[PDB]
Design a protein around this ligand. Sequence first.
Ligand SMILES: C[C@@H]1CC[C@@]2(OC1)O[C@H]1C[C@H]3[C@@H]4CC=C5C[C@@H](OCCC(CO)CO)CC[C@]5(C)[C@H]4CC[C@]3(C)[C@H]1[C@@H]2C
Ligand SMILES: C[C@@H]1CC[C@@]2(OC1)O[C@H]1C[C@H]3[C@@H]4CC=C5C[C@@H](OCCC(CO)CO)CC[C@]5(C)[C@H]4CC[C@]3(C)[C@H]1[C@@H]2C
Ligand SMILES: C[C@@H]1CC[C@@]2(OC1)O[C@H]1C[C@H]3[C@@H]4CC=C5C[C@@H](OCCC(CO)CO)CC[C@]5(C)[C@H]4CC[C@]3(C)[C@H]1[C@@H]2C
Ligand SMILES: C[C@@H]1CC[C@@]2(OC1)O[C@H]1C[C@H]3[C@@H]4CC=C5C[C@@H](OCCC(CO)CO)CC[C@]5(C)[C@H]4CC[C@]3(C)[C@H]1[C@@H]2C
Ligand SMILES: C[C@@H]1CC[C@@]2(OC1)O[C@H]1C[C@H]3[C@@H]4CC=C5C[C@@H](OCCC(CO)CO)CC[C@]5(C)[C@H]4CC[C@]3(C)[C@H]1[C@@H]2C
Ligand SMILES: C[C@@H]1CC[C@@]2(OC1)O[C@H]1C[C@H]3[C@@H]4CC=C5C[C@@H](OCCC(CO)CO)CC[C@]5(C)[C@H]4CC[C@]3(C)[C@H]1[C@@H]2C
Ligand SMILES: C[C@@H]1CC[C@@]2(OC1)O[C@H]1C[C@H]3[C@@H]4CC=C5C[C@@H](OCCC(CO)CO)CC[C@]5(C)[C@H]4CC[C@]3(C)[C@H]1[C@@H]2C
Ligand SMILES: C[C@@H]1CC[C@@]2(OC1)O[C@H]1C[C@H]3[C@@H]4CC=C5C[C@@H](OCCC(CO)CO)CC[C@]5(C)[C@H]4CC[C@]3(C)[C@H]1[C@@H]2C
Ligand SMILES: Nc1ncnc2c1ncn2[C@@H]1O[C@H](COP(=O)(O)OP(=O)(O)NP(=O)(O)O)[C@@H](O)[C@H]1O
Ligand SMILES: CCCCCCCCCCCCCCCC(=O)O
Ligand SMILES: [Mg+2]
Length: 1197
Amino acid sequence: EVKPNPLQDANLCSRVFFWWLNPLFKIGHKRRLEEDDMYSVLPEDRSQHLGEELQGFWDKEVLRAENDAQKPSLTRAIIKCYWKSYLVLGIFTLIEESAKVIQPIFLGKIINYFENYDPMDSVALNTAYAYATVLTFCTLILAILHHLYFYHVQCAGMRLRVAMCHMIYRKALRLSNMAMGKTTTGQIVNLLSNDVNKFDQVTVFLHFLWAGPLQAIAVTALLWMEIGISCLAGMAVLIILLPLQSCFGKLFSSLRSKTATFTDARIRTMNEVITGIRIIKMYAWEKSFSNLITNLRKKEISKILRSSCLRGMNLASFFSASKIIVFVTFTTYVLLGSVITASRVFVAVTLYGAVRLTVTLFFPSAIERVSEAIVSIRRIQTFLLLDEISQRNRQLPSDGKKMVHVQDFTAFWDKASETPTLQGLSFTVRPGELLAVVGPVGAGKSSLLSAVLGELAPSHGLVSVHGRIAYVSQQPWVFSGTLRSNILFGKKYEKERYEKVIKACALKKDLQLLEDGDLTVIGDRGTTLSGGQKARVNLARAVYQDADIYLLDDPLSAVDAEVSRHLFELCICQILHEKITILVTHQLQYLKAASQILILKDGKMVQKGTYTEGKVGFQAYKNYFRAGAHWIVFIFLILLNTAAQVAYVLQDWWLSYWANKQSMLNVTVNGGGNVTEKLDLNWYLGIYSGLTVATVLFGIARSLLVFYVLVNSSQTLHNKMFESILKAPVLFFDRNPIGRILNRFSKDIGHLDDLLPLTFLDFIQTLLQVVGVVSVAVAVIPWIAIPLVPLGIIFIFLRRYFLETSRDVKRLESTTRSPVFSHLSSSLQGLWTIRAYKAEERCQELFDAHQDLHSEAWFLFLTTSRWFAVRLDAICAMFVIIVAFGSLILAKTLDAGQVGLALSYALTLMGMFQWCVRQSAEVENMMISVERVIEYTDLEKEAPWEYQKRPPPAWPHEGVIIFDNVNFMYSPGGPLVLKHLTALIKSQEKVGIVGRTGAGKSSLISALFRLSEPEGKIWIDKILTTEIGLHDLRKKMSIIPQEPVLFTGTMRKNLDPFNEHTDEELWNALQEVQLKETIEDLPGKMDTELAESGSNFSVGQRQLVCLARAILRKNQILIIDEATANVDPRTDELIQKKIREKFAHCTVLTIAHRLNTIIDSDKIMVLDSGRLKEYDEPYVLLQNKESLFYKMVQQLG
Ligand SMILES: C[C@@H]1CC[C@@]2(OC1)O[C@H]1C[C@H]3[C@@H]4CC=C5C[C@@H](OCCC(CO)CO)CC[C@]5(C)[C@H]4CC[C@]3(C)[C@H]1[C@@H]2C
Ligand SMILES: C[C@@H]1CC[C@@]2(OC1)O[C@H]1C[C@H]3[C@@H]4CC=C5C[C@@H](OCCC(CO)CO)CC[C@]5(C)[C@H]4CC[C@]3(C)[C@H]1[C@@H]2C
Ligand SMILES: C[C@@H]1CC[C@@]2(OC1)O[C@H]1C[C@H]3[C@@H]4CC=C5C[C@@H](OCCC(CO)CO)CC[C@]5(C)[C@H]4CC[C@]3(C)[C@H]1[C@@H]2C
Ligand SMILES: C[C@@H]1CC[C@@]2(OC1)O[C@H]1C[C@H]3[C@@H]4CC=C5C[C@@H](OCCC(CO)CO)CC[C@]5(C)[C@H]4CC[C@]3(C)[C@H]1[C@@H]2C
Ligand SMILES: C[C@@H]1CC[C@@]2(OC1)O[C@H]1C[C@H]3[C@@H]4CC=C5C[C@@H](OCCC(CO)CO)CC[C@]5(C)[C@H]4CC[C@]3(C)[C@H]1[C@@H]2C
Ligand SMILES: C[C@@H]1CC[C@@]2(OC1)O[C@H]1C[C@H]3[C@@H]4CC=C5C[C@@H](OCCC(CO)CO)CC[C@]5(C)[C@H]4CC[C@]3(C)[C@H]1[C@@H]2C
Ligand SMILES: C[C@@H]1CC[C@@]2(OC1)O[C@H]1C[C@H]3[C@@H]4CC=C5C[C@@H](OCCC(CO)CO)CC[C@]5(C)[C@H]4CC[C@]3(C)[C@H]1[C@@H]2C
Ligand SMILES: C[C@@H]1CC[C@@]2(OC1)O[C@H]1C[C@H]3[C@@H]4CC=C5C[C@@H](OCCC(CO)CO)CC[C@]5(C)[C@H]4CC[C@]3(C)[C@H]1[C@@H]2C
Ligand SMILES: Nc1ncnc2c1ncn2[C@@H]1O[C@H](COP(=O)(O)OP(=O)(O)NP(=O)(O)O)[C@@H](O)[C@H]1O
Ligand SMILES: CCCCCCCCCCCCCCCC(=O)O
Ligand SMILES: [Mg+2]
């Protein structure tokens, strides 16, 4: 019933033109696409079939290698599998290359006809028409057959990829444990993600490995047959283009490295900025972080400027290579005494363009892709050859075999380690007896769990595992999918047993709270689940399996204790009355009701024992370029672009003019050929050389200027955004995840620094080239303007009618790439249960289904891309037809030069248009980074850091803070946390504030700190908080928070980032915190490097450095926010003593809920309804004659 692939019933014509894809677009144009408008993968392309056939090939290869005692080669298997299906595409590649080379010959023939133009000779006209028809027939063959063949090549690559992914998943299912000892799940996921991806690219260019050279050779021959030895010179510089380009890349690569580290450091520091944004804000350390990040950004910007200059030079050289080659070869041609003509020059130009495109783009990319594919295949081969677990012997006919006995088996997980890790495995569990092994984390519990051939193949001893085994992992796991699949695990829909097990597990309430029930799919990354639910579903799966050996492992620990007891009573006593029920227990009641007890000692046990014993508008472009540079520079840049394109075209135009003038000179010299007037080679050669030099210079200048202005725009935008976010209020950080901001600062800026300038420059270059070709065609033949207007218009519509669909399918592809990997990870996470249930084929089928869906997405993406390419290339071919045939129509008003030039540029148009449209789409969809960047640059700010009031230095003279009608309001439009606060705090008063749990306390401290908006009256030392700049209040305000976060870098910055305190004071402070000896032994000393967030430093040391910073602040009044809430008692008491004596002169405010912190405080503010009607002291009510103090006194002492 699933919609079959329409390609199955499509004829040859529809397949060539991708006509059958039309309905999908008609759907896509109307509504957003989904996975139900999909197309099923062809039956021969399903993951299972490719996996099976490649497994057969690989096994045959391995057997052959073992026969002759050789190392098996994965590449040999791949070749032996796919050479038959690839040689046909190679043959077609030969055909396409032959057509591409042969087209310029007919171009020369038609130009020759134009050269010998006799209007009366109709036979010449007919021959010219035939040559034009052959030329356009070859052009059409290229135009459409190339796209069909490209789709088939990409499909072959996708087939290789899907087969390799199936291979990897199957091996991972059979993969061993010394693999986990050596490799990690991350490595396997990386193999499945990146290493296999290369196979989807190499096959694109693989045939060029033989097509590239051969074609070039043929081209060379052709060129000789037209211009002789001169051609060699041109080829020479083309060959010179190969190593130097590579050389550039090497330097580029080096520069890339020197950027990345800086960038990494940059982002790392900024992570510490975003993660501890509140800490930085209340510490007034924004300036130091800003300076550090600015230095890092400046170094990175210098490096990327160098890299972009090199890249622009390379791009301009690639763009001007054709002009360089043509100029060199025809200069050598001219000084060799030969005379130029339009036919020969334009034949040489076209051949040189084609062979240069091939050699400089397809061949190097082909070589690089082949090398990458070889590397990935080597890695996959190493993974496959990795040893797997010995195949567990198939369960022999259980002739009353439900008895397990291990006779003092001794083996270790790491047999290399001769230490007796696991030994004395001597036990016997009979049918119906449950061995509730007990012991406090006695090393060896996993072995008892792994007693059913986990990793304990009997080296010396006996193992009698017989029957079906149900196993529960230490961490219960569920794969992505519906619950029904987990419960069944391939068993039949036994509805009676299903309802019995679902009611036995007491999952009815879970289903009721669940929005859909047993049909519910696993939530996003398993978020909508809990450990208790996972344990319950694992138990339900095991009980529904109805195996013989029920091997459990702490299933009832995860679920609540009482519910665990209900499940034990309902299941173990009744359901598991007659089962093999070995279970490791941590609760006494479980082994109290056990049938067999076992006290386990490390290694050998002591004894058995008994229990008793998104479309970006023009505004984005305008803002981006305005941030770029002044509009005068923009005008200069567009003028430079126009000049570069004009010179590029006028070089060939001057060649044509030379040819035409020489033709007229030859006509004149034919009558009376005795003077033999020679055209002045000095004048023409000098003009030609000047034109090509101007082309090179303008191309280089334009590339460099575009790169410079775009990188400057990126730098300015980054600086503006950083300044904006550093001035953003905390509410913005609360309303946005840290990961989101880090992603915006990392990926978008990386785009704007690496890809956006390159892509924009390439798009501008190729668009200018296309406009140049169109303008040449129009200028040579004005009438071509008449049919050009509809054509382009059609294109525009086509673009829309494609883009509105393409994005959708692109999205689909992404949304189907993620699940596959996850399944593998899940298959790796719960692999133990998979081997326990002998259900490897089920997970294999699940993986095949997932990856078949992904193959549907890939097939749709490939097909829609090819459809758009076919239509637009048909537009190009129609344009070429128009140019050539209109030229033949108006042959009475044209010369050789202009027709040659126009036809050559029309021939060039195709690939240029392809690249221009693709680059335009890339730029458009990739400017969303710029749009988000701009949105970030225009977020709401707060009060300026520095005001103009400038309160006098040492402003907290007495620290008399007065509150008057403080109605704090947290978030605009949100709830009002605090109202009418009139606290009257005097100088040198230790107030142990308390109330409203922790939310009200946090609101109060934020309001006091001006961190939020303090709606109320605050006289901090008789000065309003409003009339003080933010930073000015921030500095002289000491606070020790609950979280002592540390920043990577040097110690000295951590104690003093602004570096205004002499080292002796730092040593005195370190002595006060009793850490002088701790830093003295550190090799880095004051310049000590710190691990990620001070990992090596302990939490006690973190609070120590925090209170050392507080000491260095020397602020008269201090805030303490739950310093010793969950810290070790030794650190608790040392910190308490530090506050007691080292802060005996400061008006501290202890904002914490801890009893010890508040008892010492002389004053505690009592608030009821915000109005203190009873003007008294707490001491008259501290003797439990109130409500709250009664609670603390009774409960907590
Ligand atoms: C990539 C490089 C581009 C430049 C270059 O190498 C390859 O291109 C080659 C062409 C060679 C010349 C070809 C023919 C003649 C024959 C004779 O003069 C004509 C006599 C006349 C009688 O009727 C014809 O037979 C004298 C020698 C001369 C001029 C050659 C000299 C070397 C030249 C210039 C070579 C030069 C170094
Ligand atoms: C990538 C590389 C860039 C450099 C380069 O190759 C390709 O560019 C080529 C240009 C060649 C010269 C062109 C013309 C002639 C004249 C000829 O005789 C003329 C005599 C007299 C009456 O005929 C003239 O009025 C002798 C040979 C000479 C000087 C060539 C030498 C090789 C040169 C320098 C080649 C050089 C190695
Ligand atoms: C900043 C921008 C730089 C480019 C540009 O704008 C400004 O500068 C302009 C100069 C123009 C050229 C001036 C002279 C001629 C010669 C003539 O050829 C007749 C041959 C024969 C016929 O009988 C004579 O007897 C016509 C063509 C050509 C090359 C012009 C082409 C267009 C050009 C390149 C314009 C171009 C748009
Ligand atoms: C943008 C770039 C700069 C301009 C340019 O390239 C593009 O545009 C081209 C226009 C060309 C000229 C057009 C017409 C004539 C015909 C005839 O006029 C003899 C007059 C003389 C004797 O009677 C009077 O004393 C001789 C040739 C001449 C002047 C051309 C020369 C080359 C020129 C200047 C080219 C020049 C390099
Ligand atoms: C942007 C870059 C600036 C430098 C540059 O590239 C572009 O600018 C180009 C201009 C070229 C000259 C143009 C005209 C002539 C006159 C000719 O003789 C005339 C004789 C008689 C007419 O028949 C006089 O009435 C001899 C050659 C010469 C001087 C050219 C030499 C090369 C030059 C200098 C080129 C140079 C490499
Ligand atoms: C945005 C882009 C800026 C650059 C650019 O595109 C747009 O601006 C265009 C101006 C074009 C020239 C205009 C006129 C002519 C004369 C004509 O020759 C005789 C014609 C007729 C006489 O009877 C029939 O033969 C053909 C050649 C030439 C020089 C054009 C060359 C291409 C040029 C340089 C184009 C160039 C690529
Ligand atoms: C980017 C844009 C692409 C299009 C375009 O701009 C740039 O490219 C320019 C080239 C121009 C042509 C150059 C030479 C001539 C020869 C002249 O000879 C008159 C002889 C006699 C009989 O008419 C007079 O009575 C007639 C006019 C013509 C064909 C021009 C037409 C306009 C054209 C097509 C321009 C057009 C607007
Ligand atoms: C070279 C090839 C020629 C044929 C073709 O590919 C390229 O050209 C494409 C253009 C597409 C149409 C664009 C817009 C509309 C919108 C809406 O109707 C609006 C009607 C209204 C417009 O002014 C008044 O008429 C319904 C869909 C429709 C007609 C598209 C249908 C598919 C078409 C015909 C495509 C077709 C396969
Ligand atoms: N992968 C392994 N590599 C080496 N030794 C292993 C491995 N797995 C198990 N062992 C051996 O078995 C012990 C496993 O520790 P153990 O405390 O039994 O884990 P557990 O069964 O997960 N216990 P718990 O999670 O506390 O209920 C090790 O200390 C080794 O003696
Ligand atoms: C002359 C060749 C131009 C090719 C470069 C692409 C030009 C695109 C012109 C249309 C701009 C976008 C119009 C709306 C469609 C969209 O949202 O992409
Ligand atoms: Mg254990």
